[PDB]
Design a protein around this ligand. Structure first.
Ligand SMILES: *[C@H](O)[C@H](C[C@@H]1CCNC1=O)NC(=O)[C@H](CC(C)C)NC(=O)OCc1ccccc1
Ligand SMILES: *[C@H](O)[C@H](C[C@@H]1CCNC1=O)NC(=O)[C@H](CC(C)C)NC(=O)OCc1ccccc1
Lengths: 299, 299
């Protein structure tokens, strides 16, 4: 089982660069609007406690340099929506895919197209942690890189990159500019809160093991969802939601193992350990594969 | 620090579907030629023991159905080059990138664009194992998917997919149709030679772990090159050459850790084990990052 990104071409055709003064970052060109992090309007010294409303008052359309490659797109309007800037340009992007803006939940995975100066550099899968950080690979100039899922040629944009935390993990917004987690776009000392293991994804991984014939851990017990959630939190595991139970439906139907029966198997794993045995060749339980990821890879 | 693939857009625009009789796989459409695995011409009975030159002489241009999205391309000629078929079509692919065909060396990495029915499905990074298999993620209908590297917008195609071994690893050819490894495109269970670990890549990855604030595995010892290689061979690691030591030069200068000092670190890791500790979140020593891969991502 491997981390597989979505093909990135539909998003590559949407990446541009946005410069204000000497600060350049990336933007997302869809139809006639370019979306980018609002801190592009900041001077390096204005990043500690910026007054974005005041900094933007001093900006006009002609202060924004938007480029597809080296080709300038003329800006004809600007506005700020939460933590993102929306620059209306005079050209509709002919490579605009069918798309949606979606806000994802902790545990969901997405592909990141890492970009610098509007030029895509690499693509990789990330999972949103329960503390609303991601373990990205981002360098200076990566802001405005986006995360996405693709379903039947419709690109669902879910993440735009804004910052690195001192622990070296990353934080950002949805495409309406609302941060995931309790972070703000100021170059201040912020810290990721204590993280937890993504229970729904561990369960998805156990189903993947069962699908492939590795099922020693299937026990004879069951549990209630509430009883499981209370024990799981004693082990730094996330509690399950009703939505988690439902997204495990397909894998549960495929294997014939009830979701609550699998929870009881996981609970036993937590209370006694793996006892020197592996699952899918690994001694660690993997929590960055969603139920969709498991089915997507197997079909 | 993550396993990161190249952006796949330049390759996506080249993928097509190729059908012959009941057999469907993917092709690579560059200019006016479509490249695909030659076993597309085999029925299920032919797959067991095919005489490809005999099977091919009996095919006509119209036995080949090539589809690029919804439009059908007309095959106007066809030839076989080793294990690859070259179908000449009456349309030039307007999305053909600047490209080269290259044969990669064991230990080098590349990105795979997994495709089904001519449609790209996922992208991920692979390494050519020393035994000339790759540890991929490929299902029925993935043949003709390609591996590649991208430099300054020039796509270097290095791999085309043909088969899965009983152990679950994968085998294929360069774009000239020559297999990597002692494998043949016949429907028989084939074993690979004993695999070995790519030493220069493990060392590059340890240096990446230091660039990301992890040093628990470092020690005060040092070792000679020959003494290290005696231990490496004992653990089924590939020899480390002076060319390798030189290629690791930049990473050693960045961290101030001499190559042979890091070799003493790896020797201790190999002789003592990892003690249930982890490096970059991994419980095993990772060998599918090249020194170039580490530098590109880390800088
Ligand atoms: C966006 O281009 C950039 C991405 C960072 C750069 C290095 N790796 C990254 O992920 N974002 C920032 O530089 C961001 C800007 C703020 C307005 C949000 N600042 C940031 O990430 O700061 C890190 C930091 C904060 C406080 C002290 C020291 C470093
Ligand atoms: C091409 O689409 C396909 C890809 C395989 C299918 C499953 N995963 C893959 O990667 N290739 C084949 O089906 C290939 C066709 C031969 C003519 C080369 N056969 C194959 O992979 O068979 C493997 C095998 C044969 C006999 C015993 C055990 C394994």
């Amino acid at each position: 089982f491997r981390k597989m990104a979505f093909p990135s071409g539909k998003v590559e055709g949407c990446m541009v660069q946005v410069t204000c003064g000497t600060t350049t970052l990336n933007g997302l060109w869809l139809d006639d609007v370019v979306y980018c992090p609002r801190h592009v309007i900041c001077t390096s010294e204005d990043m500690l406690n910026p007054n974005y409303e005041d900094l933007l008052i001093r900006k006009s359309n002609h202060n924004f340099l938007v480029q597809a490659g080296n080709v300038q797109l003329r800006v004809i309007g600007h506005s700020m929506q939460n933590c993102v800037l929306k620059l209306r340009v005079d050209t509709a992007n002919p490579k605009t895919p069918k798309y949606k803006f979606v806000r994802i939940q902790p545990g969901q995975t997405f592909s990141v197209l890492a970009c610098y100066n509007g030029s895509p550099s690499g693509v990789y899968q990330c999972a949103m942690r329960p503390n609303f950080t991601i373990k990205g690979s981002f360098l200076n100039g990566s802001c405005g890189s986006v995360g996405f899922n693709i379903d039947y040629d419709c690109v669902s944009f879910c993440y735009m990159h804004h910052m690195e935390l001192p622990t070296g993990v990353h934080a950002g917004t949805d495409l309406e500019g609302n941060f995931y987690g309790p972070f703000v776009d100021r170059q201040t000392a912020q810290a990721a809160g204590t993280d937890t293991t993504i229970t729904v994804n561990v369960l998805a991984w156990l189903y993947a093991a069962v699908i492939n014939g590795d099922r020693w851990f299937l026990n004879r017990f069951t549990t209630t969802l509430n009883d499981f959630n209370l024990v799981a939190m004693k082990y730094n595991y996330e509690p399950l939601t009703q939505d988690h139970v439902d997204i495990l439906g397909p894998l549960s139907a495929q294997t014939g193992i009830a979701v609550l029966d699998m929870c009881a198997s996981l609970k036993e794993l937590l209370q006694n350990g793996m006892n020197g045995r592996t699952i899918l060749g690994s001694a660690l339980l993997e929590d960055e594969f969603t139920p969709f990821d498991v089915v997507r890879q197997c079909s």
